[PDB]
Amino acid sequence: FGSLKDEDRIFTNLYGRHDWRLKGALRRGDWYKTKEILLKGPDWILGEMKTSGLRGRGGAGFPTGLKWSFMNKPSDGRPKYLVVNADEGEPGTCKDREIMRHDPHKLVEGCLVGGRAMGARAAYIYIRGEFYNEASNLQVAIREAYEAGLIGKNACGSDYDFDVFVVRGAGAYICGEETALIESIEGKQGKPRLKPPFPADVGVFGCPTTVANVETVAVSPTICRRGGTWFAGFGRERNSGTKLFNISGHVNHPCTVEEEMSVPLKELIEKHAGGVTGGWDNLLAVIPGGSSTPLIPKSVCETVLMDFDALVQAQTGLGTAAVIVMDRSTDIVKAIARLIEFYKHESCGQCTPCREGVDWMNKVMARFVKGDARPAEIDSLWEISKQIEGHTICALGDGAAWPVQGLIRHFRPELEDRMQRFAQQH
Amino acid sequence: FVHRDTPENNPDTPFDFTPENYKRIEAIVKNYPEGHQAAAVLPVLDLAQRQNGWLPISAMNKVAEVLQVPPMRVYEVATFYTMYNRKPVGKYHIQVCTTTPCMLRDSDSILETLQRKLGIKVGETTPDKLFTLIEVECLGACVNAPMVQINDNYYEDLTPKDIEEIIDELKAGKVPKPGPRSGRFCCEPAGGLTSLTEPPKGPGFGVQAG
């Protein structure tokens, strides 16, 4: 039912309006119970997230507590590590750009609060290189914090030691991937690894490692402060907590609001943000989780609401919860076509199914926009789509297939007409 | 992806980190874990790019040298990332975001305007060697869709003439107020701040017991 209270809202500094710097952060009281929390114990911190039942705030959804629980196993003589990926290459994920730029500190204490939960020696934050200015803001914030002694050895007047670092991204969406963030951190080409050697087991520099969406690291200190329950209540069943929602494209006031999860899709454009540009009936389709997730047409649009369980029922993913909206004024065949162009210019090429498959769909999709291709080809793109979906080394091939599948699933008649249109003029 | 040695772009172009640059280098390595020079190549390659935009084959060889890694190792890193430029870069190097979010909100619109203003095709440097336009992909900051990152200018929410205005500012003078030239602040509902219009609770507000 959304409509979270401002007091409950996590990032009060969202939209700025409060000094992103430490003195603003102190008025925010972000560093209020940090010593106590760490003192309580690592086990106490994970109890808090397990009670919260928080799901991954990045595109993949998994219990946050269980993921952190995995490398809570005893150290084998290799320093455990924390990796925070501030890269958000996915379209509509300007969300994480907020916490980093507007409220850098929340993430800094998120890092050490999270750090003792996994007993990480240190945390590296991979902010996308594109955001150079953004980087300027966080290390100013990180510098403040150590000057204070909030972070560093004996951080926050406690036995525990932590050091936080910022790493430059270099314009790659794939760098975002969990195994590939590591390799970029390692300095090799940004190519994902296979999951068998799981990230905790062989992390970075062969030392256990864990990767979290910046939102996931940022909420952990406040969730421990507010307790898992407070946070647990807002969510729906497995779904829980407020997740920032970004609405971009064909809406009167595109904005990122951290309104509550489980929001009726019709409600968030209509009530907050801006009602769909041109009217709620001028909605050819909604992209709920960003480019990777399949778009849902207006028919199912309001019925369903934004929570991961409800979306998977709907065949779409909450993902980064980036709402991209397409009025009846857009050539979807071309809209999704550029997302496949978005993925041919970006997939690493390490795996055969994504390399040739994504390029193959790009060629077919461009012909589909022209209408040159015959109607029978449509289904083949589908068959090409699932070959890529289950065979890829990472999830990006998973992601490339879904928008193609969505276009065929709900807009098959329109593509046939574009097929028909070209055949008629000869 | 092949460096055919050319008089301009080839090692005859000597490269060496400024005494100041070399300093920056050491710092980088330490930031990274002990005994792991390799992690520092993407940052060290970035400072070679900071030094000079061209970053020729000579510059990459130096990077490998300073970082004591297989030279190819540096060559592979430079080729994989779009951030690094292996060819000369225009002073301004504007990049226009053309992913679906920006296109839906008119990103394409901007392009046509910029091509005419720079009076040049998309993808190459102006004769003045002062501007370079490229159709880059999602640069983040989608809520503000119309967008053009010029060396981190990340101007956003830009109407066509806005850019023209910005380009002129760049063409005569400098620092043209980089950022969303729109009235809104950072990302904010153009209407206002529905999320939080109240004052923020202070330190230790409703902090749970335990």
């Binding site: 980087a135 300027s136 290390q139 | 920056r24 710092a27 980088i28 930031n31 900071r50």
Partner: peptide, 13 residues
């Protein structure tokens, strides 16, 4: 500044 992020790194170091 082109090197401001990098200069900010040395102080942290």
């Amino acid at each position: 500044n082109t090197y401001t992020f990098l200069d900010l790194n040395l102080d942290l170091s």
